[PDB]
Ligand binder design. Structure first.
Ligand SMILES: *[C@@H]1O[C@H](CO[C@@H]2O[C@@H](C)[C@@H](O)[C@@H](O)[C@@H]2O)[C@@H](O[C@@H]2O[C@H](CO)[C@@H](O[C@@H]3O[C@H](CO[C@H]4O[C@H](CO)[C@@H](O)[C@H](O)[C@@H]4O[C@@H]4O[C@H](CO)[C@@H](O[C@@H]5O[C@H](CO)[C@H](O)[C@H](O)[C@H]5O)[C@H](O)[C@H]4NC(C)=O)[C@@H](O)[C@H](O[C@H]4O[C@H](CO)[C@@H](O)[C@H](O)[C@@H]4O[C@@H]4O[C@H](CO)[C@@H](O)[C@H](O)[C@H]4NC(C)=O)[C@@H]3O)[C@H](O)[C@H]2NC(C)=O)[C@H](O)[C@H]1NC(C)=O
Ligand SMILES: *[C@@H]1O[C@H](CO)[C@@H](O[C@@H]2O[C@H](CO)[C@@H](O[C@@H]3O[C@H](CO[C@H]4O[C@H](CO)[C@@H](O)[C@H](O)[C@@H]4O[C@@H]4O[C@H](CO)[C@@H](O[C@@H]5O[C@H](CO)[C@H](O)[C@H](O)[C@H]5O)[C@H](O)[C@H]4NC(C)=O)[C@@H](O)[C@H](O[C@H]4O[C@H](CO)[C@@H](O)[C@H](O)[C@@H]4O[C@@H]4O[C@H](CO)[C@@H](O)[C@H](O)[C@H]4NC(C)=O)[C@@H]3O)[C@H](O)[C@H]2NC(C)=O)[C@H](O)[C@H]1NC(C)=O
Lengths: 206, 211
C-alpha cells in the first residue's frame, strides 16, 4: 500500500466562488485488505468532514482508494498543514503524509507576452509566448484566450525555481500563421495570490 | 524487492555525450547499505559484455545511519548515442544474490531542434533588467543542453525549463537569460547555444541584439 497527498488546484484557492480541497490517495490495495481508513488533521487538529469513496480495481488487478477534504481558502493560503493518516481497520500500522502551501513572502508574477520569432514566421503555425516570472509561491494558473474566447492549443512548462528564490515559467500557444497575421488579439491570463483580484491578463497582437 | 529498490542507475549528461573531448559517465548508486553488510561489489556490462574500467568509491555515511556506495563507468560517446545498453550488477562480497539495473538512451528517431530567439517584451523594456528568451522545439530525444554567451564569454545569469512533451511526440523548452537593460540598449549581441545529437556537429547557435 502506497499513499499520495495532493494540494488544491490553484484556481480553487484563489476564487471566493470556488471550493479548494486536498486529496489523499491510496494505491496497491490488495483485494484481501481490510477497510482502508482515513484520519485528517489541520495543524494537528483532527477534522471529520472528509469524503471517502469505496475501493476500485485497476488495470493491474490492485485496488485504489480516495479521500477528499474540503479546505478553507484562508487556511490553505495562511500556510496551514494538512495531514492525511492512512490505516486498515483492526490493524495497528499507519502512514502519514502532510502538505501545505510553501512558506515565504508572496511575490507578484510579472507577465510578458512575446510574439513569434521572425524566423518562425516562415512556418504555417507560429508560437505565441507568455513569460510569467518572479512569482512566489509556485501555485499558479495560466490560460489563453482570443477575442474573448478560450484557446486550447497551448502547453505550459512547470514552474522553475529561479536563482533569486522566486519561480518562472513559460506558456506557448500555437496558432495558424493566418490567424496571427489577420490581427486577432490573443491574451494570456494568470491567476496567483499576489495579484489584485488574483488575476491579470496581457494581450498580444501583430 | 526492498533490495531491488535501493539501486539506482543514472545516465550521462547530454553535453558530455556530444563532445568527444568531454567525459560521459553512467553512475550506479546503492543506498541503504548497512554497517553489517559485506563490501558492495559491482559488475558492469555493455550490451552484455563485461567491462572492467569502472571506478568504485568507498562507502560514504549518510546522515540517517546508512551508507551509500557509488560506482562510475566512463562510456564511449558513440556507444551511448548508438543506443548500447549499460548494465550494473550489484552484490555483496561472499554472498550469491544480486540486483541488476540497465539503462540506455531513449529509443525513437532523433529529431532536430528548431531554435528561435525572442527579444524582451516591449512592456519589459521599462525595467532595469530584461529577459532574452530562447525557444527550442521539435527535438527528440529530450536529452539537450542550452547555454548563453556574449562577446566570447559565457553569460551565466540564465535558467532553462525542463523539456516538455509536445503533442507530436517531440519536446520543447525555453531558456531565459536576464541581462541589465543597459547592456541590451547598447547593442550587445547575445547568443543561445544548443547542443543535441540531431544537430549537425551536435551544435547550433542563434543570436539576438537590439533592433
Ligand atoms: C538515507 O539517506 C540517503 C541519502 O540521501 C541523502 O541523505 C539523507 C540523510 C537526506 O539528507 C537526503 O535528502 C540526502 O539526499 C537516501 O538515499 C536516497 O534514496 C532514495 C530512495 O529511497 C533515492 O531516490 C531516488 O532518487 C532518484 C533521483 O536521484 C537523483 O536526484 C536526487 C535529487 O532529486 C538526488 O538527491 C540523488 O542523489 C540523484 O541525484 C542524481 O545523481 C546522479 C548520480 O550521481 C547524478 O548523475 C551523475 O552526475 C555526475 C556529475 O555530478 C555525472 O554527470 C554523471 O555522468 C551522472 O551519471 C545526477 O546529476 C543527480 N541529479 C540531481 C538532480 O542531483 C529518482 O530517479 C528515483 O526515482 C525513481 O525511482 C523511484 C522508486 O524509488 C520511482 O518512484 C521514480 O518514479 C523513479 O522511477 C524510475 O523511473 C524511470 C522512468 O520514469 C524508470 O525507467 C525506472 O526504472 C524507475 N525506477 C524505479 C521505479 O525504481 C528515487 O526517487 C535517492 O536518490 C537517494 N539519495 C542519494 C543521495 O543517493 C536513503 O533513502 C535514506 N535511507 C533511509 C532509510 O531513510
Ligand atoms: C496499478 O495501476 C495503478 C494506476 O495506474 C498504479 O497507481 C500508481 O502508483 C504509482 C506508484 O505506486 C503512483 O505514482 C506516484 O504519482 C505521483 C503523482 O501522481 C499524479 O500524477 C500521475 C501522472 O504522473 C497520475 O497518474 C496520478 O493519478 C496523479 O494525478 C493526480 O491525481 C490527483 C488526485 O486525483 C489530482 O488532484 C486532484 O484533482 C482533482 C480534480 O478532479 C481536484 O482538483 C483536487 O482538488 C486535486 O487535489 C491531480 O490533479 C492529478 N495530477 C495529474 C498531473 O494527473 C508522483 O508525484 C509520485 O512521485 C513521488 O513519490 C515517489 C515515491 O512514491 C518519488 O519517487 C517521486 O520522486 C515523487 O516524490 C515526491 O516529491 C514531492 C516533491 O515534489 C514530495 O513532496 C513528496 O514527499 C515526494 N514523495 C516521496 C519522496 O515519496 C508517485 O510516482 C501513481 O500516482 C499511481 N497512479 C494512480 C492513477 O493512482 C499502481 O502503482 C499499479 N500497480 C503496479 C504497477 O504494481
Amino acid at each position: 500500500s502506497s499513499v499520495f497527498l495532493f494540494p488544491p488546484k490553484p484556481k480553487d484557492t484563489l476564487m471566493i466562488s470556488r471550493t479548494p480541497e486536498v486529496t489523499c490517495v491510496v494505491v496497491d490495495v490488495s483485494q484481501e485488505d481490510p477497510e482502508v481508513q482515513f484520519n485528517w488533521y489541520v495543524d494537528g487538529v483532527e477534522v471529520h468532514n472528509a469524503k471517502t469513496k469505496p475501493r476500485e480495481e485497476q488495470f493491474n488487478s490492485t485496488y485504489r482508494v480516495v479521500s477528499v477534504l474540503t479546505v478553507l481558502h484562508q487556511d490553505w493560503l495562511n500556510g496551514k498543514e494538512y495531514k492525511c493518516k492512512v490505516s486498515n481497520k483492526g490493524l495497528p500500522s499507519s502512514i502519514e503524509k502532510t502538505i501545505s502551501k510553501a512558506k515565504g513572502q508572496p511575490r507578484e508574477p510579472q507577465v510578458y507576452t512575446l510574439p513569434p520569432s521572425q524566423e518562425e514566421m516562415t512556418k504555417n503555425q507560429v508560437s505565441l509566448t507568455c513569460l510569467v516570472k518572479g512569482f512566489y509561491p509556485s501555485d499558479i494558473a495560466v490560460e489563453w484566450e482570443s477575442n474573448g474566447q478560450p484557446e486550447n492549443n497551448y502547453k505550459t512548462t512547470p514552474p522553475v525555481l529561479d536563482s533569486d528564490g522566486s519561480f518562472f515559467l513559460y506558456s506557448r500557444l500555437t496558432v495558424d500563421k493566418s490567424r496571427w497575421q489577420e490581427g486577432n488579439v490573443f491574451s494570456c491570463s494568470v491567476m496567483h495570490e499576489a495579484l489584485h483580484n488574483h488575476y491579470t491578463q496581457k494581450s498580444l497582437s501583430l
